[PDB]
Design an enzyme around this catalytic site. Sequence first.
Site, mmCIF file in Angstrom:
data_model
loop_
_atom_site.group_PDB
_atom_site.id
_atom_site.type_symbol
_atom_site.label_atom_id
_atom_site.label_comp_id
_atom_site.label_asym_id
_atom_site.label_seq_id
_atom_site.Cartn_x
_atom_site.Cartn_y
_atom_site.Cartn_z
ATOM 1 N N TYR A 104 0.820 -1.195 0.000
ATOM 2 C CA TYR A 104 0.000 0.000 0.000
ATOM 3 C C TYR A 104 0.863 1.256 0.000
ATOM 4 C CZ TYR A 104 -3.680 3.379 1.146
ATOM 5 O OH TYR A 104 -4.559 4.462 1.111
ATOM 6 N N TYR A 163 -3.483 4.353 8.686
ATOM 7 C CA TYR A 163 -2.579 3.214 8.516
ATOM 8 C C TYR A 163 -1.214 3.429 9.249
ATOM 9 C CZ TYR A 163 -1.450 -0.798 5.469
ATOM 10 O OH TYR A 163 -1.148 -2.045 4.981
#
Lengths: 290, 290, 290, 290
Positions: free
Chosen positions: A177, A187
Amino acid sequence: FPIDLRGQTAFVAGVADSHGYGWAIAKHLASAGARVALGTWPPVLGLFQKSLQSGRLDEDRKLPDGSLIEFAGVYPLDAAFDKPEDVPQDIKDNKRYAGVDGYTIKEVAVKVKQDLGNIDILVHSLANGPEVTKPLLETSRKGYLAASSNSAYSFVSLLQHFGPIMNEGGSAVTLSYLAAERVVPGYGGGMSSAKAALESDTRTLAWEAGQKYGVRVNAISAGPLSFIDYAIDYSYNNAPLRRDLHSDDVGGAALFLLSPLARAVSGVTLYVDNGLHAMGQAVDSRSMPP
Amino acid sequence: PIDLRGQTAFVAGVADSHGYGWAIAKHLASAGARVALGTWPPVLGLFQKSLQSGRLDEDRKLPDGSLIEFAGVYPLDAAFDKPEDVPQDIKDNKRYAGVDGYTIKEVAVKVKQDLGNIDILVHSLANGPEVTKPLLETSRKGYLAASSNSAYSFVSLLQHFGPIMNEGGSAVTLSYLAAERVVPGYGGGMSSAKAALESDTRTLAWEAGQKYGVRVNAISAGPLKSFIDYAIDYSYNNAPLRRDLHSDDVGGAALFLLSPLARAVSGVTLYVDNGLHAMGQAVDSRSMPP
Amino acid sequence: PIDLRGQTAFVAGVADSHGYGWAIAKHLASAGARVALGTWPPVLGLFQKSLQSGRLDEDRKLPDGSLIEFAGVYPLDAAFDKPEDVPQDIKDNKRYAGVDGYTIKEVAVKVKQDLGNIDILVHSLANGPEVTKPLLETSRKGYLAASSNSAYSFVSLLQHFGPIMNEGGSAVTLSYLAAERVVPGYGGGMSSAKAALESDTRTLAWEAGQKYGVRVNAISAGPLKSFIDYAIDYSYNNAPLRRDLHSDDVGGAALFLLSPLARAVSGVTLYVDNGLHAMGQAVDSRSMPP
Amino acid sequence: FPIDLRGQTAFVAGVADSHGYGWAIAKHLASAGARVALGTWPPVLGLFQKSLQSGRLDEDRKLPDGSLIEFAGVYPLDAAFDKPEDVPQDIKDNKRYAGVDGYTIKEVAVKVKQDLGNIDILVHSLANGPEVTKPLLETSRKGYLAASSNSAYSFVSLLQHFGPIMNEGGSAVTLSYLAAERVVPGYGGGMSSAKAALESDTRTLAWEAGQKYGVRVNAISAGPLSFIDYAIDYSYNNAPLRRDLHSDDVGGAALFLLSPLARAVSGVTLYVDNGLHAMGQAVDSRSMPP
């Protein structure tokens, strides 16, 4: 004929259900005529297995023909353990773990080899952050170290154990990602950091396996399929492409990385993200007018 | 499988049959595309000629065994955008006799008429008159020449073709590692032209992405005595995958990039180079031991 | 000029006087900073000892000619965050006798009391018990070890020091090229630990940037027979600047990064490596000619 | 004493007024005790010269002491021309151009050498996009090619001509912007592309000059000092640092790149941008809540 995978066997670590990338990839791999085996988290190996043989997944096994995806086995696999001496007692004794055995990475490799011979395609579609809600300044050591173990080091272990049973010209793929390379708030408890490690290991391992095994090692950094809902709209509104990121988009892309069309492609990080990686600025910012 | 049937591809810069342009068209055709060719006019009559006689019948083989056919071969000089931009000594230049309408815009109009909307656009164009000269010995004239032939042309290809491109279409160009990292010997500003070229690939991705709903990507290729010779040898000796880089390798990776499989892929530089970009050192060094 | 007077700097991981930590502290002091030192407790008594006798008087020279002095030398084991996290066999381990409170949090409390708020924080810490082993032969245990010593520790340093850091302060860590590109031989997961480390540098930059108004940056250094030996030789033979990398070079670039001159600088990886990162090939290759 | 530039002479191409980076850098360079000469666009060389000797700029020449910045000469310079044969007639005849002469890059280098001997520091602070308002799909060839000539190739020419009069250990610096690496709408008629070229040339030239001259070649990618107003607030709200980008921030940073503290630093792109480069997402997006 541009991607004829007939003859080839693939193993895909990280398919618990039919909505993740793991499933999508298998679907495509099989769709090109490959035998496809699955690694499944023991805790859910039962429900998944029942969920298959029930009929329930037939709309999702559905292929171009109307025929269905079939698997060369569906193995218990816990990417947190490489060999049995590694497994803690309470897990051996854990309620959701008894019945199923030989679920360490090493054990699974031996199983695949004795059941199906050598393999051609390796997929690594598993990530786990016990503190992904938490920002880095609120992430514990145990948290951080766990996120890496599950997400990053599990690829290395996989390659260690599958490499020796992988045909020359064979290839492996993993998922990453943005946050690995560029900050993305949300995140998430060292998940970003593990991903960075994965991308470096993706590169290093492309060198190591390239030489020892003649094996291609690549990564897909993907867009997003709550934290999410916003992320989905974020990308919808800021991507070069005004479209949603379907799972087939990633599956699609993995098929290539794992076909002989990518015979010269290794160590790569392929952005499959409607092009978001390419911007240096959101167009829907509160600081711009609309 | 992957299915370009019903689809039409324009490949700019195919004069020989050993370049990437050839390789790419070849691949698109194998996947069922209509393929049209744009050629630098001094070599057109000849190229068109050598095709038609039966010369290239071996290099047109088809992997079934049939031969690739072209919905057109077009004069294309990518140094000119409008007819207006052509200097007289060129209009007069003997080498250009017979041919007319090879300015990007004109080619577009002809393509639009003869064929209509396209879906796939290839940019196989790089030319730098001072390339053998190091950057400290490259002139303004040649450096602009290089940028004008190997960067801008891509921008113009899009500007003029974008309009006739189906939503969901994709374009690709070809870059080289020197654009990110010093390759001594790759001079004349080609290095610089290519960094501009990778950059435009991202910018255009956004713009064409938004305006025509089209994708824009790059393949950064390795090398396909000489300066090439040493290059090939180096990469063979230092890349993760110890192989030669065939043009089919690039061919196939374009074929993925220009296909529906890549619909979430935009704005990328894809290294099709046996993994070499991934390296931080040569195992080859006269500083190292064997 | 540039003026760190009135300012206090904490440098974690200075045991020898030939490492980067030494070099960095040395530089901060030259610019008029209060410098405190954190040392891995097994070497503290000794290090503290060798300082106090007059041993290091030559390595403390001052470029005026005076000698650098320390507002403290602190036990610091960066493997532990709380006292709680220390295992007994360590608490008991003879090598640790006398010393107490070397868990990141404890050091912070002591520093906060003895000195108060700091402005400069250095992270000179990297340790990987399997570093000589290639990545395909690195264990989970050592790989986590490496991440735990060379990445997380930075996160914890910030988590615990952030609170006592003046607005406009800055922290720095030290990375290595292998974290972005394959350096064979730099194993044990140190490669991976460092990619995580550069990534955290960006994430933390955001977070600390926002929360404490602090900057977070990295210096990706070159090399300061052996595997080092060949490394040094390589870089000397292949870097744009044909020189040896002194530790003062890194020293000075930290000194810039940690100073007001760098107040708009955050989240960077700065290559202090004689230009080597910029290269796409070795001029050295046994594939090339001299 | 950490940056003693006494002894050193610098030449700074691109100072028309006191608000650009060019001025800011000179201010800092001189501030470290360097002799500093200026290249000035002939069209404005008069007004600038009058603007100096008037007294008007004394608040802006003002240094730490209360003393003022003094220059070793202020030369006509047009970075669009390398040697006089290059200059078009109408420019020679242009109203704002008569009076002033020897303004090509080559001529200016010869002048600096005959007036001040060899130089130590080279700054390149000039960029010009005749179509910067226009998006890439609306940018002309002439536009694009001009943006590159003024912005990108002018650095190469500069280095070509100054290199041979640059002391060993000497260094050069230029200015870039995000858009080189990541799309930023607004910027602007090939300006993005030229910048990409500059950063590649920054790298290549660090190799070329490193070897032939022993000279460091680096770049600062800067934040923003209309299109702008929004950009300023964008960064204010999305940067790791909730602060404005002053010109001193860049000047500050250039001083380092051009001091012997950066003796091992070459081919670099230093982000001096309150850390914006590091994010993969705007926090003030219309798609997030506030």
